Amino acid sequence: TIAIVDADATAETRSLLSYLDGVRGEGILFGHQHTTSFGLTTGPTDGTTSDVKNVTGDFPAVFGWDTLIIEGNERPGLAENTRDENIALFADYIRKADAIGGVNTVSAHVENFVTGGSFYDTSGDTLRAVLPGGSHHAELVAYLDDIAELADASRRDDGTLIPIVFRPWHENAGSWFWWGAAYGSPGEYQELYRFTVEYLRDVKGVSNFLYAWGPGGGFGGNRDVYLRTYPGDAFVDVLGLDTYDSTGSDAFLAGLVADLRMIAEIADEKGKVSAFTEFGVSGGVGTNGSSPAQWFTKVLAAIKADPVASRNAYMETWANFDAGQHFVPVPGDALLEDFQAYAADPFTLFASEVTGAFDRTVAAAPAQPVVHIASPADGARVASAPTTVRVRVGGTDVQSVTVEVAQVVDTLDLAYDGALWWTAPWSPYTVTATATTAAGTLDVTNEVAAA
Numbered sequence: 185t186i187a188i189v190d191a192d193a194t195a196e197t198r199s200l201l202s203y204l205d206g207v208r209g210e211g212i213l214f215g216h217q218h219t220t221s222f223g224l225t226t227g228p229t230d231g232t233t234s235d236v237k238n239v240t241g242d243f244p245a246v247f248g249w250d251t252l253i254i255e256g257n258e259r260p261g262l263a264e265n266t267r268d269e270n271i272a273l274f275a276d277y278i279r280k281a282d283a284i285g286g287v288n289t290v291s292a293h294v295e296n297f298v299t300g301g302s303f304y305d306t307s308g309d310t311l312r313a314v315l316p317g318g319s320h321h322a323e324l325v326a327y328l329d330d331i332a333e334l335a336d337a338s339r340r341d342d343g344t345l346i347p348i349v350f351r352p353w354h355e356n357a358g359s360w361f362w363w364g365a366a367y368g369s370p371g372e373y374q375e376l377y378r379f380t381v382e383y384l385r386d387v388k389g390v391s392n393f394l395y396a397w398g399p400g401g402g403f404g405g406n407r408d409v410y411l412r413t414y415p416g417d418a419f420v421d422v423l424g425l426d427t428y429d430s431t432g433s434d435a436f437l438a439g440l441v442a443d444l445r446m447i448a449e450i451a452d453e454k455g456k457v458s459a460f461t462e463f464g465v466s467g468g469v470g471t472n473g474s475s476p477a478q479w480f481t482k483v484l485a486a487i488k489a490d491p492v493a494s495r496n497a498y499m500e501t502w503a504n505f506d507a508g509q510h511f512v513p514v515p516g517d518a519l520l521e522d523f524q525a526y527a528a529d530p531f532t533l534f535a536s537e538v539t540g541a542f543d544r545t546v547a548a549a550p551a552q553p554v555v556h557i558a559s560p561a562d563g564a565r566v567a568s569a570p571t572t573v574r575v576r577v578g579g580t581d582v583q584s585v586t587v588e589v590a591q592v593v594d595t596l597d598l599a600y601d602g603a604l605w606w607t608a609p610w611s612p613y614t615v616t617a618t619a620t621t622a623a624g625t626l627d628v629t630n631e632v633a634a635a
């Protein structure tokens with residue numbers, strides 16, 4: 185039996201999670217973003233050819249994708265298409281990847297709902313606007329519905345749902361994305377991530393998703409900084425780390441190993457899976473990138489030389505968009521030889537070396553009882569205006585929920601909305617919710633700031 189975020193996930197999904205954890209320390213799966221949709225040696229793509237396959241002889245073990253496909257911003261998604269047809273093309277590539285024998289993972293560089301800009305547009309205060317009760321919350325819900333559609337469309341010909349590692353709101357420790365650290369307190373981020381899990385799982389019924397959380401990189405092995413944004417054991421299956429470098433220096437490598445063993449330890453302690461969710465040469469390996477000498481093998485060596493840092497299930501590098509920006513070396517790139525050596529190394533696993541990932545029979549541990557206040561989120565700023573307090577109680581039968589605004593200037597009696605939260609209108613420092621449930625009396629406290 186294993187601790188899995190979706191206690192009622194399909195058998196294949198539970199199996200993948202089991203497989204990923206057992207692979208740790210034994211071998212690491214190599215992954216590549218848009219491996220069959222973007223390539224410099226493949227010619228027009230159709231989801232069946234890859235630069236990785238062409239330069240190493242085998243497809244990557246992990247096929248990474250992104251909701252930008254749905255938006256029609258990245259192939260096979262097309263600008264002219266409706267999100268529904270893009271979704272159809274998206275599922276087709278996942279099915280094909282599954283057929284080839286790889287594991288699928290989906291990240292989400294979500295469009296800025298407020299400005300109409302990209303994921304890089306950090307103006308608009310979009311993170312708070314997208315939180316439950318926010319002005320553009322309905323926009324996020326609709327976006328998540330399309331993802332739920334994608335999850336449902338990802339099925340083998342026999343109808344079996346294809347498992348997918350979903351990794352939303354990544355690299356939030358930095359501020360280059362609108363869901364970054366400068367646009368929302370750690371608490372606001374946690375509610376965004378938590379809502380995303382609950383909405384897809386508890387409201388849409390998605391059951392072939394494994395949830396990954398990777399706040400970024402360069403934590404120097406500091407558990408406290410790494411977990412400051414942590415969504416919680418009940419919301420994460422895979423603990424990630426995103427790190428790029430163009431120096432190849434011993435300092436970089438030392439820092440990397442520190443970070444990699446940190447997540448492996450946290451993972452083992454919690455009985456979860458850890459993985460090098462994103463890695464690569466900064467700026468890529470092409471024209472606008474760099475060619476650190478033997479970067480791939482040096483990084484691999486450092487990883488497998490450490491018994492703890494090697495306990496990570498997979499490592500995915502980025503897409504091969506064009507000559508100026510690509511992460512997997514192709515003929516003409518100085519790092520090609522080194523990358524091929526990295527691929528030939530016994531410790532790195534590719535598609536053909538991944539078998540029986542979805543054939544294991546593991547039981548899902550019962551869902552753990554949790555209670556959290558979706559609004560106002562911890563760390564949020566509350567204006568004098570009228571708001572709604574919403575509390576989420578999952579993994580157990582709830583009879584009642586109460587909230588006390590201390591500083592006890594108020595006491596509210598909530599009512600279930602009949603899908604997700606227990607709410608009550610509130611007209612404005614400490615907000616504590618107490619829910620009388622079958623698992624007993626559960627409470628949680630959020631500290632908010634007044635405007």
Ligand SMILES: C[As](C)(=O)[O-]
Binds near residue numbers: 355426462502
């Ligand atoms: C390649 As990225 C924007 O996920 O760091």
